[PDB]
Structures are given as structure tokens and as C-alpha cells.
Amino acid sequence: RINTVRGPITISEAGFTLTHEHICGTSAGFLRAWPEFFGSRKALVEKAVRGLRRARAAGVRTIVDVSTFDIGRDVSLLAEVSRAADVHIVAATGLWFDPPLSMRLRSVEELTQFFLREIQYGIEDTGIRAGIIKVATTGKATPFQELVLRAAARASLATGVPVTTHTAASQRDGEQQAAIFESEGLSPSRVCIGHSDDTDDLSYLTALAARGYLIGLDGIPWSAINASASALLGNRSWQTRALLIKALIDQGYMKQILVSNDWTFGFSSYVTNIMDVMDRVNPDGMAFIPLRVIPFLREKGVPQETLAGITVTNPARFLSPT
Amino acid sequence: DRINTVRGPITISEAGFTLTHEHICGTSAGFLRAWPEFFGSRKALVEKAVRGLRRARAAGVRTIVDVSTFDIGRDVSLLAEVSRAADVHIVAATGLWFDPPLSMRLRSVEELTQFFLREIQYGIEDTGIRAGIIKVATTGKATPFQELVLRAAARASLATGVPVTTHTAASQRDGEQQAAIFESEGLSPSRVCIGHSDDTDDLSYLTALAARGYLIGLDGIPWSAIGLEDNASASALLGNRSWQTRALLIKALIDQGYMKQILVSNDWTFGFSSYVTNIMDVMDRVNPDGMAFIPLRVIPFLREKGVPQETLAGITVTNPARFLSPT
Ligand SMILES: [Co+2]
Ligand SMILES: [Co+2]
Ligand SMILES: [Co+2]
Ligand SMILES: [Co+2]
């Protein structure tokens, strides 16, 4: 009962899934208005097809595109790349930290209708329904960012669809988001505190993992080992971020881990050549988790059925509507 | 002599009575397609727009310049559909207003110049519809990004001959900073309209810009929140100045010899989502005439005050014709 861009699929059809990915990290209407920024729309489709086929050959069967309205989600692009690559792509709703005036002047009740429109009816005029809700917070929650967290909760409770968040982990936003989700009546088993790998703090993660929250260790290839790339991605290495997966397995929270790359095939919501800077830091792309992180954990003393539990059974339990 | 409309190129003589600053929808990038239910439905918005433009046409309007940019949620397909059904020429816009998303605000002046050029020379999105005007904006002192938008607009105008029109916080005298930046790029004042100029009563500011060759946009004549001072949202947007006060600025500029520098419009819309929810209903109640307000209520008002019919015809037909013509 998991909604994808090609239609509804079952829990067994999901397989190896990456919980936090992006085909394109852009802005609302941007891809349609300026496709030449990515070379052409043809070039972005071709680069995304080759990148997903690389992930499929590596073991991945499903990717969850957490690109929201304001990240410039184009479900028609998501459907085209999914068809040519034979990889299941799950679409998303919600609002990130770049909402336009028509979204930021809306009440909590109006934002619930929009989220409920994209999950129950469909996205735009395509009929494609959203299977996950993406929300954001950069530091302490602004008066509007609180309404998005609450609206995402009211939409998750009426459909059963899960929530995934953006967090500035060094500032520990996951505790405030958790306090807001719990005040709304949302079950912690339906929420994923993303970007939790941006910190080396383990005491903040185990506290949330004990309450039932899923920990999103999603930006593993993000290593700044360029003032723009050093501020966006990486103070530490990938080995340090991948050791945080092992540190949570050792504490007995193997059922709460969700791994991903947080990769893109086109990036426009930052500096011009950030995609070219990223493409060489990680030449593996979206295939970094099964080819470089899984054999690392196998060498550092973690069995294959613990890793096959994190990648197959954990995201399938998360993405299933309850 | 030839200008781009959403139905294709037309000869300037066919433009006729032209409203220089209007919107079919005041929204945000991708909003109409992602949430048409905000406006009832996409079909309801089209029907309302067609009815409004048909009524405006019956009153004498032949062309409107939709100054909706990418970030005002310009949907050219909607503009084309309504233009064809109402049989009113609609000139589309490029440029950037004051709500650009991350992918726009992180761009350099060279990249923004290429985006504006693409929308004028090649087309908007995958439609083939080309922009006939560049819309820019400042709300007080220009931010570093707004300065880049103004420079890119000036560069695209110099390369194509297409005019530039602006949004200003008129009380803050924004037109002076805008003018300075445009002229630093070598753009002729005759290719620029300093809009929302009816938001101020400072005639010294207006005549000085007009004296330099700038077109003065007295473009929101029906905007008045008198009678509804209890509505904090409507008062902050529409202001407390009467439609008459805004319209008398057209007479004031004519009297000082600047009839050739005046552009008049309503700054109306059929859908409004970039503000509070009830705003379109409130606006439609204050002004039931919509875009027809200029020929039905403003033109006869100025005739009562003594302005000749040939001067008014010069402001509504000749001035927009000279402005829109690629020069
Ligand atoms: Co993020
Ligand atoms: Co992301
Ligand atoms: Co304006
Ligand atoms: Co306007």
C-alpha cells in the first residue's frame, strides 16, 4: 500500500530503499522555466536515468524523493526517470525552508488541505499521490515553521503517511520538532529526524531513539575533505558518519536506523557549479550506500542481516500507511 | 512596430486602449498548478478572467500588459487561454519581483541576464510565448540581489529593445535609486516605467523623473481601503487614499506638461494568493468594475475636471504604444 510515481506497490516490492533522496534540488517552477541551467531537460533525465540504473545494479530497488513543492518537485520527471531505470520512486508533500508568499501567508488549516490534496487526490493534474511528508527547521522554529510541523502531523494522522524532517543537528532541532509532533498526537514511529548525522552527539540520538523516533543518518557521502561547499557539506568524513550507524546498533536501536545519500542529479538552490563539486567528492552518487558504506560496516564488525534489516525491513515498515 | 503577445506578434496600431500594469493572477511560482482549489478551480479562475476581460473590452480596452513575473506565478498558458477567449491582447512579462526563490536569488547578474533574454528571445517555458516587457521591483532601499535584477533587466532591454517596468515603494521614492542603477548601465529613461507612482502625493519626485524621460505609472487608481479601516490587512495593502486622489495625479502631471510621460492602469487581478485569503473578495467588493474601472470611471472623471479627450486618448493609446514598441 505504498504510493509511488508509477502507481501503488506492496511492502515486498520495495526491497532495498534509500529514505532521503532527490532527483533534482531546485525551486518551484524553475525546471520548467529554465531547463538550460541543467544543460537541458533531456540531459537531466539522461543523467538521472544513468544514476538510478547505477543504483539498481548496486542493489537499490526503491528511492524516496523527498523533494517538496518548494524544492521544485516535478512528478512528471520522477515518473519518466523511474520508467527508464525500473526503480520505484516515492513522491513527497510538505514544505521545506523556501516557501513563497502564497504558502507562507496560509493558516495551519489551509496548509493541512494542501498536504491532504497531494496525498489523497494527487499532485498537480498528474494523479500521482504522495507517500511521505518532508518538513524543515534551521535552528529554533520560526512562527511559520511551527505551522508546517503541525499541518504535517494532522495530514499524517488522517492518511497514515510518514513524516521525514530536515534538521540542523549541531543545534539539536530534533527535540523541539519532537515536542511539537507529540503535542499534536502523532506517534513517534511515523517520524524520521533527518540530517542527524551532521553531529557527533550520540546522547541526543539515543534519547529520541528510545522514544520510538527513527533516526535519519542520510548524508553519509557529504564530506568537505571552497567556502560554499564547506558550509553546506561536511566538517567530518564519511567514515565518521558511517560509524554513527555502528554506534546506534551497539546501543540496541537497529530498528530505528534509516540510511540514505541525500544525493541529487541537478542542484540549483545553491551556487552554480555545486553539482560538479559534488559529483567528484562522490563519483558513486546514489550508489554510495550499497557499494561503499555496507562493505565498510561488514569490515567493522556488523553482520549482513543487521544491514539488510536497515535497508529492506526498516524503510518498508516506515513507508507503509498506519 | 511589432510587439510580442501571448497569441504571437501583432502590429502596434492594433494594440489600441492599453492597460499597462495588470495581472490575470497574483500568485507564486508553481502555485496555480499545485493548488488550483485555492481559486475554486483552474476552470473557475479562467471563467472569471474571461468575463472580466470581456467586460473590460466592452468598455474600450483592447490590450493589457500582464506584468506577472516568474515569482508572481505567471502561467503563460493561462494568459493565452484567457486572451483567446476574451479576444483581448495580453503582453507577457519576464523579470523578477520581490519573492524570488533560492534558485533565482543565488544567481549572478550574467545568469539573470540570460534568463530574461531567454524569455524574450526564445520563449517562456516550453510554450514559445515571448515576453514583451521586463518587470522588476524594490520595496525601499534595494537589496544586493534587487540591484542585480535591475542591472540584468537593463542589459536584457538594451539587447532586445523591450521595455522595463517597475514596482516601487513610492513613499520611499524608490524610483530615484532605480533610475540611477538603470542609467549606470546605459539604459534610456524612455524604456522605463517607474510604477506604483500613484502611491505618493509628492509631485516633485514625480515631475523630476518625468522630466528625465521616464514613464510614470499611475497604475492602481481603484486601490482604496476607505470605509474598511477596521481591516488591518486591507488597509496595509490598498491604502487610505481615495481613487479620486490617485486619479488627480494624472491631471497634475498633464497640467505640468508631462502628458506624454503618463501610463495608467488598475493593477487588478482575478486571483490573489500572495497575500491574505479573503483579499480578492474584499477587492472585488471595493471595485466591481475590475479592469474596466479606468475607461468607465476614471476617463469620465477627468472629463468632468476639464482634461481633453485627445489628451486621454494619447495617454491610453499613444503612450503605451511608444513604450511597448521595441526601441
Ligand atoms: Co535537507
Ligand atoms: Co535533502
Ligand atoms: Co506591485
Ligand atoms: Co502588479
PDB file of C-alpha atoms and ligand atoms in Angstrom, chain A residues 20 22 66 134 195 262, ligand 2:
ATOM      1  CA  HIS A  20      16.041  10.569   1.709  1.00  0.00           C
ATOM      2  CA  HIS A  22      16.334  13.995  -4.605  1.00  0.00           C
ATOM      3  CA  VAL A  66      11.720  13.927  -0.500  1.00  0.00           C
ATOM      4  CA  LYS A 134       9.034  16.462   4.143  1.00  0.00           C
ATOM      5  CA  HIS A 195      20.314  15.020   8.955  1.00  0.00           C
ATOM      6  CA  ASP A 262      20.744  12.763   0.186  1.00  0.00           C
TER       7      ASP A 262
HETATM    8 CO    CO C   2      17.512  16.570   1.088  1.00  0.00          CO
END
